[PDB]
Write a protein that binds this ligand. Structure first.
Ligand SMILES: O=c1[nH]cc(-c2cc(-c3cc(Cl)c(F)c(OCc4ccccc4Cl)c3)c(=O)n(-c3cccnc3)c2)c(=O)[nH]1
Lengths: 301, 305
């Protein structure tokens, strides 16, 4: 029993983290096979940041301008190329610690673990969700760019996020491992801001089911709702609209507990209306939206 | 910026987890050098766990009763012995992945990372605190016994917890790696409950500093107070006492932030007696007590391993 926000064991990713330096810029890279992946803004100077011409800056670079450092070992860069916002550094030796891996691009609402790193060295690991506005609410200091987010399935690491920058509001933006940003963001210091954040409704419902599975029933009620009536209400609380696909995703948990999805939706509407009234659910005084339907079956009985 | 409940990276410990079976019981063991550590209640049957005589159960067992699995490899047990509530299984070959490590006993209010495993296979990692009532509010399913808790200092793993059982209320109880229980519990299937719990005051203060560091500062006020003054109100609310040791431990955060520790205690005193309005702190409507002052310094300054 019990319910914690749980990250994946970080060992397989720890064995891939290296340090990458251009002039006075140092950040992290991901060393898989004979390729080191990192953010391309490592090649900028602070004078470039406003309107960097990345292709012009890269053409001027030589292999030996890139110092890659794995532990004590300096790695020899034998080639370099650019794919979208990610720099790809060919090195002369394959990482022996390379795990089974794949690059995946995730959807808002999906969760993953972050291995926060500085100077190629892991600082800590924590569990995150991609927000509906395509940012993540991470914990990132200067030097953290190139830290990656991942899930692990059996023994295969799926890389889904690389950290690139912190927006002025204090949240974080980055790319998949093919260098395409999540969201309408670009890697230059120009005015940009995320959409209004919203609550990940399907994740909240999944978490209410987890609470029922662990024995809390104090928030259930006798009501049911239509999908459209629920969305009309939830959106007035800045909750994401719920789709029929979300309703189908919740099938298993609704079966396992004997509570229809639109019954649970009625409970959610009432919680938004009344609050918690001094009580908690799985240890939170707030409705938690960073557990997926999949995570709930993962952690739960 | 940002502030997250953050665990230590778990790589050095993942390489030590193995499976241990006696009869129809399977749980996790910790493989360091040529010794596997795990809970001694692995030698108990159904009838045994109601009132076990462990030395007699262990006498009757022999090396080949212990089935030890390191992934697909199998370790040959060449000796067995007990230290307190932990079983020590000597194997023929040393773990090549053994990290620099030591065994430590922690204090209530100290935090650590838990690597929850099943069938010797690590599954998830999370951060938690040793409660003042010597329980931990973990998340374990059947088969998690033998999972460990640890801290990393520089390059050295400090093992501080081994998981033994779930209590009837859903909180968890275990030992240090020398098999000494945390709190007044026994490894036997009998009625047991934890004492009333309290809030780790120095950790709440540290968390308030983390909120200020991150720009959340509506709760700061003009007043100061004193330990004797704060502690009279605090104990009323089931809060641990604040000691001069706690104040000096916060000095770095006060310094980094410009808010003196006795000034911050005036803020916490007021949140107790008034609560929060409709407001949150670092996105929480509860007062958070599972971050130590060192945790906040390490996270808000970038310390790596
Ligand atoms: O040697 C190194 N130099 C710099 C960094 C670094 C760089 C950035 C960064 C990168 C790019 Cl491309 C930007 F457009 C950018 O502008 C931000 C902004 C300002 C006003 C309006 C819009 C925007 Cl977006 C910033 C960064 O956000 N962080 C960083 C800091 C804290 C947390 N997480 C990450 C680090 C580093 O890690 N190492």
């Amino acid at each position: 029993s019990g319910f914690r926000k749980m990250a994946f064991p970080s060992g397989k990713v720890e064995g891939c983290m290296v340090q990458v330096t251009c002039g006075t810029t140092t950040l992290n890279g991901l060393w898989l096979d004979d390729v080191v992946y990192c953010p391309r803004h490592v090649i900028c100077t602070s004078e470039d940041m406003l309107n960097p011409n990345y292709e012009d800056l890269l053409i001027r670079k030589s292999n030996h301008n890139f110092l890659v450092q794995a532990g004590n070992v300096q790695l020899r860069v034998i080639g370099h190329s650019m794919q979208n916002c990610v720099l790809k550094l060919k090195v002369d030796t394959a990482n022996p610690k390379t795990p089974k891996y794949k690059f995946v691009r995730i959807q808002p609402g999906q969760t993953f673990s972050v291995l926060a790193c500085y100077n190629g060295s892991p600082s800590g690991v924590y569990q995150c969700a991609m927000r509906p506005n395509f940012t993540i609410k991470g914990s990132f200091l200067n030097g953290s760019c190139g830290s990656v987010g991942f899930n692990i399935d059996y023994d295969c690491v799926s890389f889904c996020y690389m950290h690139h920058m912190e927006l002025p509001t204090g949240v974080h933006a980055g790319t998949d491992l093919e260098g395409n940003f999540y969201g309408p963001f670009v890697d230059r210091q120009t005015a940009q801001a995320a959409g209004t954040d919203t609550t990940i409704t399907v994740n909240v419902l999944a978490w209410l089911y987890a609470a029922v599975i662990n024995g809390d029933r104090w928030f259930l009620n006798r009501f049911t709702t239509t999908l459209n009536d629920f969305n009309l209400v939830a959106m007035k609380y800045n909750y994401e609209p719920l789709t029929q696909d979300h309703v189908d995703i919740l099938g298993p948990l609704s079966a396992q507990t004997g509570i229809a999805v639109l019954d649970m939706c009625a409970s959610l509407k009432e919680l938004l209306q009344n609050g918690m009234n001094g009580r908690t659910i799985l240890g939170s005084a707030l409705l938690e939206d960073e557990f997926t339907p999949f995570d709930v079956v993962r952690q739960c009985s």
